[PDB]
Amino acid sequence: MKTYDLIVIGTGPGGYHAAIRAAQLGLKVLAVEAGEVGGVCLNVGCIPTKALLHAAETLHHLKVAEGFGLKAKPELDLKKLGGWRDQVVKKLTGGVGTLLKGNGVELLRGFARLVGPKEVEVGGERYGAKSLILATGSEPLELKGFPFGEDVWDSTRALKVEEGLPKRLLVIGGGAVGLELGQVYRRLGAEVTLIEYMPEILPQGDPETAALLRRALEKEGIRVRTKTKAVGYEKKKDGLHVRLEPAEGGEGEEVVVDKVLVAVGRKPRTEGLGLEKAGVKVDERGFIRVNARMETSVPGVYAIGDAARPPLLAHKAMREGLIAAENAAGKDSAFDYQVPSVVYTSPEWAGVGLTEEEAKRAGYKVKVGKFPLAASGRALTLGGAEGMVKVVGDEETDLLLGVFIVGPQAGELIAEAALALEMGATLTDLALTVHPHPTLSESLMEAAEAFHKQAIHILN
Amino acid sequence: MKTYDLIVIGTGPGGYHAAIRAAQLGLKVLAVEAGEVGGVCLNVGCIPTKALLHAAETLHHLKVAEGFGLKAKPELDLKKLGGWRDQVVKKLTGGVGTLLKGNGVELLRGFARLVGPKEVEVGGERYGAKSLILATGSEPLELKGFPFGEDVWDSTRALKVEEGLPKRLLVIGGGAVGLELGQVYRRLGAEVTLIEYMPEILPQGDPETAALLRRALEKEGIRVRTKTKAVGYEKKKDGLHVRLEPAEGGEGEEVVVDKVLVAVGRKPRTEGLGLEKAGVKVDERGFIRVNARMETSVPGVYAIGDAARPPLLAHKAMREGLIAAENAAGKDSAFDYQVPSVVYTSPEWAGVGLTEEEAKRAGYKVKVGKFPLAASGRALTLGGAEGMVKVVGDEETDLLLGVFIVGPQAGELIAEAALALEMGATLTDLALTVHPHPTLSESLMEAAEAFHKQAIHILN
Amino acid sequence: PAAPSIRRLARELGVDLTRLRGTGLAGRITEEDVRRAAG
Numbered sequence: 033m034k035t036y037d038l039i040v041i042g043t044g045p046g047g048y049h050a051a052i053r054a055a056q057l058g059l060k061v062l063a064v065e066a067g068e069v070g071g072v073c074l075n076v077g078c079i080p081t082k083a084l085l086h087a088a089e090t091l092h093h094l095k096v097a098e099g100f101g102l103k104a105k106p107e108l109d110l111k112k113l114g115g116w117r118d119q120v121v122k123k124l125t126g127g128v129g130t131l132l133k134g135n136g137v138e139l140l141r142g143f144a145r146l147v148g149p150k151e152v153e154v155g156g157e158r159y160g161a162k163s164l165i166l167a168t169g170s171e172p173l174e175l176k177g178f179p180f181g182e183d184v185w186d187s188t189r190a191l192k193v194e195e196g197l198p199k200r201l202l203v204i205g206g207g208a209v210g211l212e213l214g215q216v217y218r219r220l221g222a223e224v225t226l227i228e229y230m231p232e233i234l235p236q237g238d239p240e241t242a243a244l245l246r247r248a249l250e251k252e253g254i255r256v257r258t259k260t261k262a263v264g265y266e267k268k269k270d271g272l273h274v275r276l277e278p279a280e281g282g283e284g285e286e287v288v289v290d291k292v293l294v295a296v297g298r299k300p301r302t303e304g305l306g307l308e309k310a311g312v313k314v315d316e317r318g319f320i321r322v323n324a325r326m327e328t329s330v331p332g333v334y335a336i337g338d339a340a341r342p343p344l345l346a347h348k349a350m351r352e353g354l355i356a357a358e359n360a361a362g363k364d365s366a367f368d369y370q371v372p373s374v375v376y377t378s379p380e381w382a383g384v385g386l387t388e389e390e391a392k393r394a395g396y397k398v399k400v401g402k403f404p405l406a407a408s409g410r411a412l413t414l415g416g417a418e419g420m421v422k423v424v425g426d427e428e429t430d431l432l433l434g435v436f437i438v439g440p441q442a443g444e445l446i447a448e449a450a451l452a453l454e455m456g457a458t459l460t461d462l463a464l465t466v467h468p469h470p471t472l473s474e475s476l477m478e479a480a481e482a483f484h485k486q487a488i489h490i491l492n
Numbered sequence: 493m494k495t496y497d498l499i500v501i502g503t504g505p506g507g508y509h510a511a512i513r514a515a516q517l518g519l520k521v522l523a524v525e526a527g528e529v530g531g532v533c534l535n536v537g538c539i540p541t542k543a544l545l546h547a548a549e550t551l552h553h554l555k556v557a558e559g560f561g562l563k564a565k566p567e568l569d570l571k572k573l574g575g576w577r578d579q580v581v582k583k584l585t586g587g588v589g590t591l592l593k594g595n596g597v598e599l600l601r602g603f604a605r606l607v608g609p610k611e612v613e614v615g616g617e618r619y620g621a622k623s624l625i626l627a628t629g630s631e632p633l634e635l636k637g638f639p640f641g642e643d644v645w646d647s648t649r650a651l652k653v654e655e656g657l658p659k660r661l662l663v664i665g666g667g668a669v670g671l672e673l674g675q676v677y678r679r680l681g682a683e684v685t686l687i688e689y690m691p692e693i694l695p696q697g698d699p700e701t702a703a704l705l706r707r708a709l710e711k712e713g714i715r716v717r718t719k720t721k722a723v724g725y726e727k728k729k730d731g732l733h734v735r736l737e738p739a740e741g742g743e744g745e746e747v748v749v750d751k752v753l754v755a756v757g758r759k760p761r762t763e764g765l766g767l768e769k770a771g772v773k774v775d776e777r778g779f780i781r782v783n784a785r786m787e788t789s790v791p792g793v794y795a796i797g798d799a800a801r802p803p804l805l806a807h808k809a810m811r812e813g814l815i816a817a818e819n820a821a822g823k824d825s826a827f828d829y830q831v832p833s834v835v836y837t838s839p840e841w842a843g844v845g846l847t848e849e850e851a852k853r854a855g856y857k858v859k860v861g862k863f864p865l866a867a868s869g870r871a872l873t874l875g876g877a878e879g880m881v882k883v884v885g886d887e888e889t890d891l892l893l894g895v896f897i898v899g900p901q902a903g904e905l906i907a908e909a910a911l912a913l914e915m916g917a918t919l920t921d922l923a924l925t926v927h928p929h930p931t932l933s934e935s936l937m938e939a940a941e942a943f944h945k946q947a948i949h950i951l952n
Numbered sequence: 953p954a955a956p957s958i959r960r961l962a963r964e965l966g967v968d969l970t971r972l973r974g975t976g977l978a979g980r981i982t983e984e985d986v987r988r989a990a991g
């Protein structure tokens with residue numbers, strides 16, 4: 033029986049943040065990892081996908097570049113691209129390993145399973161601690177009628193673009209994963225059709241900015257079918273005959289592709305984890321029930337990231353890991369923050385706060401401000417606008433409630449919006465902050481001006 | 493017949509913002525422009541320079557792109573580039589004219605001169621108004637021993653890259669203008685030597701982040717010589733023999749180049765404007781004296797932008813124009829905002845608030861936090877992590893005082909810092925905002941954590 | 953310092969922020985603080 037102050041299961045964004053923070057706070061920590069250090073985000077999620085998207089955007093932008101004199105006959109070596117992707121991933125995961133050891137955290141490789149409230153079994157050996165933090169993450173969610181196989185891919189397989197690009201790809205799911213991977217394949221030369229059950233892509237975010245992203249993707253040749261669901265498929269000589277139907281069911285239609293990417297969600301990795309031997313409550317979907325302190329139904333046992341609750345985002349997991357670590361260390365921390373969401377497509381999509389509908393439901397007197405990128409000098413100097421900023425606020429208190437952005441660098445600009453919400457900023461605070469000219473960030477400032485009908489670069 | 497409530501002299505960022513805001517508040521406006529609508533920023537400043545920088549960065553990044561399989565033999569046609577640059581400028585300046593007209597603003601072409609406290613003369617005709625807003629901008633500052641000519645360019649001439657790139661270029665001045673145009677020319681194939689009189693480039697900004705920018709430029713082959721001044725030169729058969737000398741003087745040295753770019757500053761266009769006939773006070777440097785309300789020594793007469801006071805920045809002029817217009821309209825607005833400054837080189841440089849030295853001078857218990865981009869996952873997915881974020885704050889109150897950034901998108905990230913300062917954020921506020929992962933904006937959050945000695949992605 | 957909106961509101965209402973003691977979190981001046989001082 034080897035003991036520690038804390039045992040962290042999983043070294044993904046959540047787990048390694050928890051391990052490190054706890055260590056900084058004086059705790060003796062043991063971190064357990066069954067696969068690659070760094071979790072999904074660094075190995076088969078955020079990182080490799082962002083890498084591929086950057087290469088795709090670089091290639092894509094050359095078409096606009098011909099417009100300003102850049103002549104070139106681009107040829108993209110997919111094996112070399114995959115190599116760079118692997119290189120980036122290795123650098124970052126090795127980096128996490130050095131951070132853990134540099135902080136004095138003990139790393140044990142193997143699959144950890146609880147055998148009790150405060151005891152874990154790994155490789156037949158027992159380990160105990162005063163506090164446990166469950167950061168097991170999630171995995172690709174299977175879709176009825178589309179079992180993963182040689183022709184039905186999950187996001188991990190989709191990352192391996194060097195294993196041959198299909199001529200025709202069908203993407204199931206209009207969330208961040210489907211959209212990003214759909215655009216990567218499209219830019220790399222494939223025909224791409226994406227289907228989404230809900231009325232609009234990114235059903236969790238603002239419909240207006242999401243629609244603008246969809247139209248932009250459609251302009252690139254990506255066929256997007258909303259209010260449509262995939263029911264099944266039949267493999268024939270000419271390809272996979274996929275059967276589609278209206279969301280609410282009805283007349284069936286068919287589409288033929290070479291491969292299918294299923295990106296309809298994630299399943300928390302909470303089965304076979306010994307939770308039923310420790311008394312840890314799990315909800316119907318597999319998520320470990322937790323409170324703002326990230327505490328489970330069992331005192332001293334915390335759960336964070338994808339294993340604890342949606343949204344299944346990295347920065348969220350990271351912050352949750354810090355909260356759980358701090359409390360395990362004796363502090364009184366709690367998670368009560370605005371969590372932004374970003375889609376790294378081109379244009380990018382980003383959002384934080386309340387959508388127009390959520391604000392209304394919350395009882396606010398909803399008012400909005402909008403600013404198109406077409407009126408942006410910076411957008412023009414970057415090769416041409418394509419997007420908009422929408423701010424949602426209360427017409428009575430002038431409080432900023434939500435921000436949605438579609439355009440280049442949307443992901444970088446949403447942090448300012450996140451800060452604004454945390455600081456309790458009003459639309460006037462945002463409008464009165466002097467944003468640098470010329471920059472894409474100005475769109476947030478002018479959207480705020482537009483909210484008060486006094487934007488300068490557009491007629492009100 | 494035809495009377496006006498307000499006459500705005502100049503349609504640069506300051507002037508057209510003043511005219512438009514005044515029109516929005518119900519004033520009858522007359523805007524006078526002696527040259528191209530849009531002023532320096534849109535015609536020969538911000539816009540054309542940023543367009544050239546983008547083209548150069550697009551070409552430059554292809555070298556890193558070869559690393560991920562993008563093979564090509566890029567060739568940049570300067571004539572085509574110049575045409576696009578011209579297109580971007582025309583599109584925007586035409587947009588300003590459209591906005592002015594759309595707001596009911598009367599545009600008069602000619603050079604305006606005051607002939608009294610509230611009367612202006614343009615082309616022999618007289619116009620009067622209860623309010624006058626002076627937004628005449630500035631012009632390239634001439635340097636002793638380097639009068640502008642065929643071989644000695646100002647920034648305007650330097651913009652015409654399609655008129656023959658010099659084999660060897662000497663840039664005098666390590667400010668935003670010299671650095672940006674210097675990098676453009678270097679990336680276009682010219683050998684570039686840049687001299688700065690001060691000990692470090694961007695002498696008004698943080699020396700640490702500024703130094704990192706200098707090192708990056710030196711890596712590209714730009715020979716930067718700080719603590720060095722240009723004394724004079726003499727045209728010879730093989731080129732211009734320029735005499736360099738230490739800032740303090742002494743050891744004389746000569747460098748041979750084909751062209752000299754003088755970017756040592758600007759001079760406010762306040763002479764021959766009739767200020768002495770109106771009673772408007774001007775300081776020794778030529779700037780129109782104004783208070784927080786942008787009011788001059790003459791009631792009803794305001795001055796904004798470059799003509800009013802440094803820093804000579806566009807977003808500042810735009811805000812000052814809004815304040816002046818609002819005050820001319822009977823409101824009571826004052827300029828008390830944080831003004832960020834951006835250098836659009838690659839990597840970019842941006843800063844806002846107080847440097848360590850200034851914070852110390854103001855009596856704060858200076859403490860800093862630093863986060864290197866080499867530890868950024870997003871930076872790596874973009875093909876290179878080179879830069880850093882430094883936050884300056886007070887150790888006792890935890891109040892944020894300044895933020896300096898060097899790296900890609902620094903100009904976009906600085907907006908978050910400006911808002912933070914405007915909202916009186918503490919380092920804890922900055923660190924607690926959940927920044928999206930992976931993004932470059934995360935560097936601000938982590939720099940804040942580092943300030944508290946608990947950054948995660950780097951040892952503390 | 954106070955947020956832009958509060959500083960602007962103070963000018964509008966003729967309130968001198970340097971004479972006020974905020975009742976917000978860490979002495980932060982609120983909009984109601986300004987309105988309360990105004991009349």
Ligand SMILES: Cc1cc2nc3c(=O)[nH]c(=O)nc-3n(C[C@H](O)[C@H](O)[C@H](O)COP(=O)(O)OP(=O)(O)OC[C@H]3O[C@@H](n4cnc5c(N)ncnc54)[C@H](O)[C@@H]3O)c2cc1C
Pocket residue numbers: 041042043044045046047064065066067068069070071072073074076077078079081082142143144145167168169170187209301305336337338339344345346347348349376929930
């Ligand atoms: C293609 C794709 C792209 C994405 N892009 C983004 C993006 O751009 N931004 C974003 O915010 N999010 C993105 N996400 C989601 C993001 O990856 C997750 O939110 C994040 O990885 C969750 O962190 P985590 O620490 O909770 O879990 P995970 O990273 O999954 O890590 C859990 C770790 O625990 C290990 N583990 C599990 N069970 C055990 C056990 N019993 N014993 C020992 N070790 C165990 C796993 O091997 C793993 O390393 C993306 C996801 C995908 C699929």
Ligand SMILES: Cc1cc2nc3c(=O)[nH]c(=O)nc-3n(C[C@H](O)[C@H](O)[C@H](O)COP(=O)(O)OP(=O)(O)OC[C@H]3O[C@@H](n4cnc5c(N)ncnc54)[C@H](O)[C@@H]3O)c2cc1C
Pocket residue numbers: 469470501502503504505506507524525526527528529530531532533534536537538539541602603604605627628629630647669761765796797798799804805806807809834836
């Ligand atoms: C190469 C270069 C790059 C720059 N890049 C940036 C950048 O990236 N970001 C930034 O913030 N700043 C930048 N600047 C500085 C920025 O351009 C100025 O701060 C900004 O244009 C100032 O606006 P303004 O309205 O005060 O003056 P100006 O834009 O100069 O406009 C004044 C206008 O008044 C007209 N005028 C003058 N006198 C009269 C008269 N008597 N009668 C009638 N009309 C008159 C002029 O013709 C002009 O159109 C750059 C400058 C240069 C040279």
